Design a binder for this molecule. Sequence first.
Ligand SMILES: [Zn+2]
Ligand SMILES: [Zn+2]
Lengths: 130, 68, 41, 203, 240, 34, 145, 370, 85
Amino acid sequence: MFSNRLPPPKHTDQIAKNVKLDDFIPKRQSNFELSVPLPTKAEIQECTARTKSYIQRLVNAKLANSNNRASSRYVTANLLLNNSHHIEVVSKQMDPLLPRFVGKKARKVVAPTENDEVVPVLHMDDPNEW
Amino acid sequence: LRNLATQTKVQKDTKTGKITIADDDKLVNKLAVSLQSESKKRYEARKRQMQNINDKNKQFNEKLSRES
Amino acid sequence: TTSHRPQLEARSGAKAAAYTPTGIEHARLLPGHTTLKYRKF
Amino acid sequence: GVWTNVEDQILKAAVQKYGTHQWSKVASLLQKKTARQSELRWNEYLNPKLNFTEFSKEEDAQLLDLARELPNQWRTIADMMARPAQVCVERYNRLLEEEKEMLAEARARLLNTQGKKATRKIRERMLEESKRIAELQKRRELKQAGINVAIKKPKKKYGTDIDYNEDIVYEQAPMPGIYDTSTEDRQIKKKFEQFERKVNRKG
Amino acid sequence: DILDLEELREYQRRKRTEYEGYLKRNRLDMGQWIRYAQFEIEQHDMRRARSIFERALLVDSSFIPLWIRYIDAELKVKCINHARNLMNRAISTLPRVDKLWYKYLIVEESLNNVEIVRSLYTKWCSLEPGVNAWNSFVDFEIRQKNWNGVREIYSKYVMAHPQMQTWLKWVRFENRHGNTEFTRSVYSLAIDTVANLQNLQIWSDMEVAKLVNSFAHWEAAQQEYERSSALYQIAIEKWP
Amino acid sequence: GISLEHPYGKEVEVLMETKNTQSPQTPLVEPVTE
Amino acid sequence: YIGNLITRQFEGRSNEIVKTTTKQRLDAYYDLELRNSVMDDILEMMPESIRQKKARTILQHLSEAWRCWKANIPWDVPGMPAPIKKIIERYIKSKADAWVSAAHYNRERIKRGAHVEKTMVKKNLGRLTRLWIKNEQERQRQIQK
Amino acid sequence: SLLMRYDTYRKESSAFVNKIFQPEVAEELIVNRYEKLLSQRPEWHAPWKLSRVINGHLGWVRCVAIDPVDNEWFITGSNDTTMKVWDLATGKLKTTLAGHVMTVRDVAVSDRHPYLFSVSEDKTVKCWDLEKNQIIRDYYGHLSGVRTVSIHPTLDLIATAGRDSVIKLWDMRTRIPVITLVGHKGPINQVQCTPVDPQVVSSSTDATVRLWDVVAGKTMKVLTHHKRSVRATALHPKEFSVASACTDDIRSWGLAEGSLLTNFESEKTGIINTLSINQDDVLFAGGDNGVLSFYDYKSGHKYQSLATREMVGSLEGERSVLCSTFDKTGLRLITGEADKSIKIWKQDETATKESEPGLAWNPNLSAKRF
Amino acid sequence: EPPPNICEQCLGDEANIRMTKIPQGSECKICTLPFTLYHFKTSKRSNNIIKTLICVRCATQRNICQCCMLDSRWHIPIQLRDHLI
Ligand SMILES: [Zn+2]
Ligand SMILES: [Zn+2]
């Protein structure tokens, strides 16, 4: 427009692939009224039941493996190997006067921190005062 | 880039998925030698600066003189 | 003095998570207040 | 009890190390002085902040006025004049008319930076390296004599203790990227084995 | 000192025990980690050196001298592809640190692998960095004498950093190389954009004045007194 | 305005609460009854 | 009892005994948490984000400020940044308020005849003589002012 | 090329940016983002003003929790190791709960049980039966001082974290630490429990926010956009979103995805000690410098800046706001502060969108975060 | 918790094998950590009792049987396997 008003003259992709601009940009700035809906009760109750059953299995495992005989008060066999063999799994009754877990000891372990996925850090761009 | 100026193919292996670089051994060696020699120069310059009641105590007093 | 030092970082609880309990019965972990109360609603 | 010039120099050098709140340490150098006397000597003569310079005419006027407004209260007058008290009292009166051994101990103590158990620790390190070099040289003699004794590894302080030569102790390999490292891997292996043969034969 | 391989093993055991004890008692001393890795480089055992650098990164991945030491250590022993993987990882975890990008660029430039230098600049600039990266990219392409590449960069540059000093950089580049037609078109595009985007209030009034002032002076130096004088009339009509 | 009587101004209530106004045994949630 | 003993005999002792905060450990844990609080605040507000040596320097200034408060010496470090000065004075005032509260409470226990440790009595004597001299110094200075 | 394209466009001439410049996707250009940001208008919110000041704590007020059921009272923990329960209507002291030997750092009242949970710098986690005002359970196993507790909205479960850099989930009844979440590289400042996966959100001194799958014991997402320690966090009560803050940098996140929603206009606000989100889409941020900032949640627009004034005898550094909550109706803000007071703020009923518009909407393009 | 890794040559040819599981009953020969012990006999009246000597994660790391430490595909020892490859 503006330039027309003047008179005429007389005289490769693998580099840093985990990093993308779509992750730095906030999604809601171009649309304030974007909805971020709460989960419905059909989601809440389902995952609540799933999580409750899992947590109660962990409580049961902690209780049942303790040495207190009263712990069971509050506690709420087949395999196929190499596709050919049917295995009947039993667990014979332990001598109650022997230690319940023969291999169990207090031993320290340094766990390996293995991780295949690199995580980006996503920042943006007078010293005598400090 | 100034220092670099004064002195003067790609394939993917299907069986590993890994890139290969066909770069010249002369430039690889020269990059390694440049890093070694610049490290030596920095290291020795800092030594010459170091050579100009105890070593730590006088370093603390010098730090206090810089503070003032 | 060098035995006598400040805490630079605290011990991470991730280390304790790396191995299993060893079955000591603590008195404070015995059963007690075994039923949860709930509100009117 | 008169203060010597050497005692004054010892006190200043001691306060450079110990500050103005550790007078029992200062007095442990000044053999004939107590901590009480040393704090007095500092605070009233040897502290460099004290102004012993001659009074201005304005200061003489100020001092005479304060001596009327706060009679005999010379520590208060002195704190207002920002000068020593005995100076103010003398001014008011004017206007109305073998020791080498102690220094040797002083230098020895003050230039000692290490402390006791650190000194014992460096002594222990010296003794440990002495025993190590004993084993090394004995092994070398026996090797020249043609009886090849192996070097004894250190004793494990606890049952799970580590020998750091047997394994790369907590190996964290670099995660494999897009570029093929194989050629320079075999080059590095060549370099390492060459170095090992070299140290075996050349030392 | 050391006359035999067994004696070297004894020395290495003692030093490794020392360094590992101190790093056990205080892992956060990054300098201690660095000089332990340096010790293992002195032993020519690059597997141990790499492992120590990796563990040090696991203690603190944000510490830039540790990254630079590891990259330089790989390059010093001619392990270029290890260094390439490492630098790619470095920028991948810390893309906003200029030093890592420059370290990758300068080593691939020293090996005259021009295409991936260009690719590195392309990937860097797409992530909206500061002006230093764009300036370095135009410097790269002029030192390769890839002129229309410079034009493409400045075309994208002005839509990453739209303040007027970017536009005047583009008109400077076109002007001092003598490309008068390109110079006129870029100046005209600048005044077009400030007019069409006026209601967004991107530029100061002094800044807009600086643009049209310089365009008028350039047209006068081109001996187009009519066009330059007219330009001020249209600008005054637009910006009273 | 603001004064030494009312540093926060006339519109603001300032309380200096030293004493518990309930017996300590008083419940904070009343026990349910059915 | 016997179960825990025999468990220790076979399984061994737990690696991760967490000591609780008893009254012998109270002051040390207070110091650790206060130190971490000061360090969190200052490392968050500093523009340059330089950490490793700066932290050990800053907390020495904190400890010196506490000594000055107990001595009733005016803590004033030339060239200290004003915001960091405010942070340090803030934490010194909170420690001071807790310290004086503990002095009050232990004095009340002593004068009642309640249970107090032998060392705690002379500790309280110490704190209270600090507080009395501090108050007498404030009185003398206000008379002069 | 751009210039030949520009010339043919000039011939044809005998928004503009999208015809001459060519991204692959429209928002890649900065001008399009600023255009679509500047066209929109933030919602108006009435200004806040101080209603009441309560004194009675002997140390700093470190945490607040409202009665989540009847809105009748609120509880505060302090550096003086006590907890005090306050009548919200009159501001008067109901009762004092004395059960900790160090600073009470966080308090949470359960909406499903008559239980108060409290945590302290003395490493203990304690549950109080509010039908008796007595401790009934202790939860043991934190190596260091505990900084926060959050009560799970649906499960009989609590989450707690502190300087030991882990979140431990406890079954309320058996007092077992069922799950320990590992991955933070430094002290954890805030923990929020959530009714669906991600069921725990946590913020740390390592500058990350983490979203957790509690059954896998793994992160769903790690959020690495913050520069400093993420000291403050809050859940939005009516949309599936969390806000979080550094120094000068408040951000909002969609929990279903772990995606950045909003950057707030939080420049030059200092350390943010506390966040609270209103059901009226007000976000409150409490500064360590004592500045109360109020923001529109969906826009990020800082509609008000308000100064704390300290109790007369305080130091200047005691102006810090330390903790906050909205009350249940969302018409009172409670703040606990370093001057040992509680301040109650109410939204001004005399104001209108014409009478008091607040700070003007003018997003600064120079601050490229928008 | 993963299933046991036992080869057919260990299990034999009987249609059914009874197996006894003992959680944390044994310490692994390779890594010293406790593991879930499995032990069985090839038939009821065979007099030798076969047990897992190594844990499942050591076995998958090496691709070997827990009961005889031969390769779980090729049925050869680790040294000979790695030499062949
Ligand atoms: Zn194993
Ligand atoms: Zn087998």
